[PDB]
Amino acid sequence: LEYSELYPIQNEYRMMQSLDGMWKFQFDPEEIGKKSGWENGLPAPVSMPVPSSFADFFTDHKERDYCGDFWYETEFYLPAEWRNKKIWLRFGSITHRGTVYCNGMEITSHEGGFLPVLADISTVAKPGQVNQVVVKINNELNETSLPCGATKILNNGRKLAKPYFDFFNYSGLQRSVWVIALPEESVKDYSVDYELCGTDALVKYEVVTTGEHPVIVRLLDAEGELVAETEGKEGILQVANARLWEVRNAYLYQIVILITDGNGVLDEYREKIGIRTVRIEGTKILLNDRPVYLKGFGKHEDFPILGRGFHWGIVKRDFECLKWTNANCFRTSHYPYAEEWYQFADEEGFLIIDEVPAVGMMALTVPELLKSHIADTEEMITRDKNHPSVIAWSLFNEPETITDYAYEYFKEVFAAAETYDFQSRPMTGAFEKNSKPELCKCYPLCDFICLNRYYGWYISGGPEIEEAEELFRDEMDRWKAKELNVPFVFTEFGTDTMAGLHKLPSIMWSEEYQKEYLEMNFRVFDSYEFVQGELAWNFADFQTTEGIMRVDGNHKGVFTRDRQPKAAAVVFKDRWE
Amino acid sequence: LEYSELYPIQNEYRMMQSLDGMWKFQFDPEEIGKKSGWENGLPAPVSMPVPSSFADFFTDHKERDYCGDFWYETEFYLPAEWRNKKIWLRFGSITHRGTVYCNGMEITSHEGGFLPVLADISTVAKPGQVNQVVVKINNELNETSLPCGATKILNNGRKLAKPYFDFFNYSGLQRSVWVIALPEESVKDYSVDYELCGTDALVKYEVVTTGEHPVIVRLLDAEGELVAETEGKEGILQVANARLWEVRNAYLYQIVILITDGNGVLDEYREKIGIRTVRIEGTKILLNDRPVYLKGFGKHEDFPILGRGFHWGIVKRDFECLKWTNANCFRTSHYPYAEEWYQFADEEGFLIIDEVPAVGMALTVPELLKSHIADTEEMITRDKNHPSVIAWSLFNEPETITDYAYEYFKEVFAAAETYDFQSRPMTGAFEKNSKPELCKCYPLCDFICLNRYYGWYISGGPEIEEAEELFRDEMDRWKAKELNVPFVFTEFGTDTMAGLHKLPSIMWSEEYQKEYLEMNFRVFDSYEFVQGELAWNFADFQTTEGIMRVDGNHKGVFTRDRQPKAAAVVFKDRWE
Numbered sequence A: 001l002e003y004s005e006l007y008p009i010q011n012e013y014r015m016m017q018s019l020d021g022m023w024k025f026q027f028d029p030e031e032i033g034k035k036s037g038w039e040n041g042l043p044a045p046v047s048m049p050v051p052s053s054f055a056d057f058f059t060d061h062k063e064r065d066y067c068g069d070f071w072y073e074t075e076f077y078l079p080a081e082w083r084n085k086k087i088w089l090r091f092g093s094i095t096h097r098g099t100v101y102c103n104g105m106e107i108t109s110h111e112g113g114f115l116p117v118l119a120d121i122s123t124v125a126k127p128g129q130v131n132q133v134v135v136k137i138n139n140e141l142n143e144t145s146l147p148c149g150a151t152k153i154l155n156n157g158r159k160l161a162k163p164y165f166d167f168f169n170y171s172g173l174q175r176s177v178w179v180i181a182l183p184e185e186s187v188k189d190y191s192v193d194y195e196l197c198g199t200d201a202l203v204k205y206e207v208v209t210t211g212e213h214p215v216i217v218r219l220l221d222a223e224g225e226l227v228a229e230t231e232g233k234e235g236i237l238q239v240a241n242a243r244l245w246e247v248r249n250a251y252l253y254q255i256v257i258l259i260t261d262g263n264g265v266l267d268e269y270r271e272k273i274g275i276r277t278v279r280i281e282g283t284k285i286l287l288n289d290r291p292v293y294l295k296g297f298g299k300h301e302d303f304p305i306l307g308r309g310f311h312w313g314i315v316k317r318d319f320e321c322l323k324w325t326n327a328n329c330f331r332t333s334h335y336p337y338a339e340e341w342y343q344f345a346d347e348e349g350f351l352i353i354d355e356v357p358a359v360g361m362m363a364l365t366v367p368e369l370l371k372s373h374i375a376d377t378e379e380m381i382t383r384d385k386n387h388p389s390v391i392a393w394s395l396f397n398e399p400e401t402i403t404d405y406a407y408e409y410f411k412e413v414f415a416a417a418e419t420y421d422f423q424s425r426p427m428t429g430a431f432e433k434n435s436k437p438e439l440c441k442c443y444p445l446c447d448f449i450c451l452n453r454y455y456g457w458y459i460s461g462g463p464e465i466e467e468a469e470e471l472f473r474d475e476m477d478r479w480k481a482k483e484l485n486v487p488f489v490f491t492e493f494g495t496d497t498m499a500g501l502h503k504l505p506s507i508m509w510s511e512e513y514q515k516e517y518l519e520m521n522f523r524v525f526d527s528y529e530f531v532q533g534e535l536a537w538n539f540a541d542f543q544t545t546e547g548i549m550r551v552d553g554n555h556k557g558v559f560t561r562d563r564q565p566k567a568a569a570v571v572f573k574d575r576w577e
Numbered sequence B: 001l002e003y004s005e006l007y008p009i010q011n012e013y014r015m016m017q018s019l020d021g022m023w024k025f026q027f028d029p030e031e032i033g034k035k036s037g038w039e040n041g042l043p044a045p046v047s048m049p050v051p052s053s054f055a056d057f058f059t060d061h062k063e064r065d066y067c068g069d070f071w072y073e074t075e076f077y078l079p080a081e082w083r084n085k086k087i088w089l090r091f092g093s094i095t096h097r098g099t100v101y102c103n104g105m106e107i108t109s110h111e112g113g114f115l116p117v118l119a120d121i122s123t124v125a126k127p128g129q130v131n132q133v134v135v136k137i138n139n140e141l142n143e144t145s146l147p148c149g150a151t152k153i154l155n156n157g158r159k160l161a162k163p164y165f166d167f168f169n170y171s172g173l174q175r176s177v178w179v180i181a182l183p184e185e186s187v188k189d190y191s192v193d194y195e196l197c198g199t200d201a202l203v204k205y206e207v208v209t210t211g212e213h214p215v216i217v218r219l220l221d222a223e224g225e226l227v228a229e230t231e232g233k234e235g236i237l238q239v240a241n242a243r244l245w246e247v248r249n250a251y252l253y254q255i256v257i258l259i260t261d262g263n264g265v266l267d268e269y270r271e272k273i274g275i276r277t278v279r280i281e282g283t284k285i286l287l288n289d290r291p292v293y294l295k296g297f298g299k300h301e302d303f304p305i306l307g308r309g310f311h312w313g314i315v316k317r318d319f320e321c322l323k324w325t326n327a328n329c330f331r332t333s334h335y336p337y338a339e340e341w342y343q344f345a346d347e348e349g350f351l352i353i354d355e356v357p358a359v360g361m362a363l364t365v366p367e368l369l370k371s372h373i374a375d376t377e378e379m380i381t382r383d384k385n386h387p388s389v390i391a392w393s394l395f396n397e398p399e400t401i402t403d404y405a406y407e408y409f410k411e412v413f414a415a416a417e418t419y420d421f422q423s424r425p426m427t428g429a430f431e432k433n434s435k436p437e438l439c440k441c442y443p444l445c446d447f448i449c450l451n452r453y454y455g456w457y458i459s460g461g462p463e464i465e466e467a468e469e470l471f472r473d474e475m476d477r478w479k480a481k482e483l484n485v486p487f488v489f490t491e492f493g494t495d496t497m498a499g500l501h502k503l504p505s506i507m508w509s510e511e512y513q514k515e516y517l518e519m520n521f522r523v524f525d526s527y528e529f530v531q532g533e534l535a536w537n538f539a540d541f542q543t544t545e546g547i548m549r550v551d552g553n554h555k556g557v558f559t560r561d562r563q564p565k566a567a568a569v570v571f572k573d574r575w576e
Ligand SMILES: O=C(O)[C@H]1NC(=O)[C@H](O)[C@@H](O)[C@@H]1O
Pocket: A165, A166, A167, A334, A397, A398, A432, A452, A492, A537, A554, A556
């Protein structure tokens, strides 16, 4: 809100320079950096790639598992021509929390490790000179920020992250970093909302600028031809014979937002958008007025060595694999992803359930937690609302939902979410088993219900899989009898599966068991009319905390971590065709 | 060269903007792009990451194995302020060959897929506007360019690459791309050479500019303090109490090259360098006049999904692994790597044998020789000022037993010498069929690099005792020749499947990799003139598929995702 979430672009009015590359880096186990002038430069740094997670480069346990304060630094030359523009550092994210310094000055701090951090360096920037940026980061886990966990202290004074969530505590500067220059009066935010009118469409819009000058809004088609133009910060663009953004058949217009000074332009922002509606009608999910059944995966930002580090190559391979399975959807489990993921989903016509990092929520630390949760929700929706791919918000993964105070908590979150989404698209959360139909008090808040279920894995696995199926149908029969008249989507179901572990008859952990488990789940899904989607857990094997239940991370991937299909991948491909 | 090889920097005089990201991409199997005006924009593109190899993104064989012409496109806004500068597109590489277009206009073409391509767009660039770059690329293999191979045409006309080399034919825009702006009179090239004088050092230099104005050269220490200053395009910097760049103990000065016209500076180029000397004395490799024993690996630019795509993360993990093994050296098998690898070797104090892509080696030889010398010129001009680069490898397993080969390589070594201001050691890696009795080219080398697989390709497994005997036999022959030069083993290894265990060991098991290495070590240590050991390979890497390659080459000491096999600790313990 005191900054723009808009993705940076370069044109006559806006400039950008990438700060990706090798940064300087230093661990701060004694937490003395802020006390020792590290904001003016790290005393004994090593090199660290940005974007990347720092953990998997190192060869020593204490480096990989480092938990606490750690620092990044780089230097960059600022063109003289940027003088007296609004100059910002823009981090794709800072994981989990941190303070940004520039030229020795504290600029801003941010809590929440999966959304952009904007630091206004206009008054400290040195145009036509070398500038320095230093970031103090911390990756501890607690119960007043997302995602939740604890920090354990060894008798040696060493900290260890203790997640309440099933993914590895990757951290650092995991996304691209830019330094940008904006005009003194600029486009700060905008929102689009769509209506279909026969062969035509309406694009309702709102623009927020940092000034009072007039605004012109244009819409260009995919060839850059003008199809609609309008004046004012609020208005409607009429599009004749609109080419709708369709599932797995994208079409993107380009919105152009101009701030004018009479003759002259002060600012221009452009972004691709897609004309499409999403609506829940009874137990049906409708895209452009037609029912869609969601087919796909929960994913992670996870890849060998880079950790959660962003790379377009990972996006490209994953989308080719997704298409090969005939999927149409993924959920950003369990945190908003790099913006680039959504940009590409826009191009490929994929549907996204966008999820805030509200995972691991199973006292008087809740008011603070609620504040962070709402803040992350605000930032996520403000950042992602204009992607045609984003068709739902997931506002939690497996919280406590069965108490009265749980209700009041989530009422606040959903209320907040509703105020920030110009499109009021479907809002949901993923419930775990203990959110029994007879006990859960939060499912009424949801536009559709998401279930994570592991009947046949954590419950009655293996020799008991027939019992698992009965227990599954029993729970679904109870949901059915409630006649809630909402769609149900399975957002998780899967089995840990070691590539190459074959067994006849199948065993838990074998490739064959993954297939049989999936077949059983499908039989159950297909027995209930109100089921409207299936997102398997997980697209690919991914890193978790070490332990006796995780064999080099989580192996419920349908693909291996290096993005190759296990036997079960074909099962999905065949079913989703 | 009609362009600069200098790594791009940003300062008052020089600007750079990264073009990395998602480009547009289209395969051109019918070879219709140029006739269809694709240089003005691709008609039906998909997105392609840059830097990356394109092959491993796709899920269809014909995409992965695509051989022929294919195209890249992107757009970029150029700041108005770049007006009146010399504006260049700079590709880390274009694999294997290509033509660069900008705003619809043909700019330049380049043959050779592992060195920078510079395209001067000064005359077509449009400052203050969106500009367009389109690259037509071809990844076919032939016998007139490096690395050598063939192109097979299937009956339907589909092309398949047929390498004469043991690595996958990755291609595309595999390294970073920039658009840059230089002053109209700029530093185009410079060379440094070092002399040790007691506790002091001399930095001899020459500078090449695109003009006639005076040049000032400064040297700054690692803190940025001035330690030497002089005038002229040729000169000598005197450094009192020089802090030498040492193996695994780097120290980097910063050279600063200024052009001036008396209203002030016109251009400024800065780069880190390390004061060190390298020479061969008898059977010793001398670094700063002290013998050094090379310990390390042949590598590849190779990583899951990205292929040869450059990423600093790969660099960081690989150097952490290298340090953990106690290595001090690697060879850029079998092509120059992205410049960033050398920059990091400079900081980490690693020694590099820099290798031109002369691997996989009639009327076609003169053309091949020209390509080979051109690549050599580009490699040496690009890499000569890295303190890490201590030697040039000018081939990997060519024919060497004929007079024809001798005349050919005489020209290559002569050219390399003329291009290298430092005149540092030159070498090449020899296959076993280059018998001590038959090879005519090893005398061209300052030290001899051998690739040997006694215990793998020769008498492996149950015959390993015979392999050791045969190995000692060959080394005894080399010994009796008393060449008085260092020998470095640049390859030795066994394919090793992670998790394949056997007692007693078998070929392909982790235990056999250990035993093979131990046997090789016993042999190395038996001969005084052996002065280095670079194992094949640092990590498992991709090859053409076939009955001899189980998902690529598994001679890695590390897995492809960079985790140690059992034999990794054998190196760690020995090199400690
Ligand atoms: O056990 C699992 O494999 C998964 N189940 C869950 O319920 C979680 O939501 C996931 O994060 C977790 O990875």
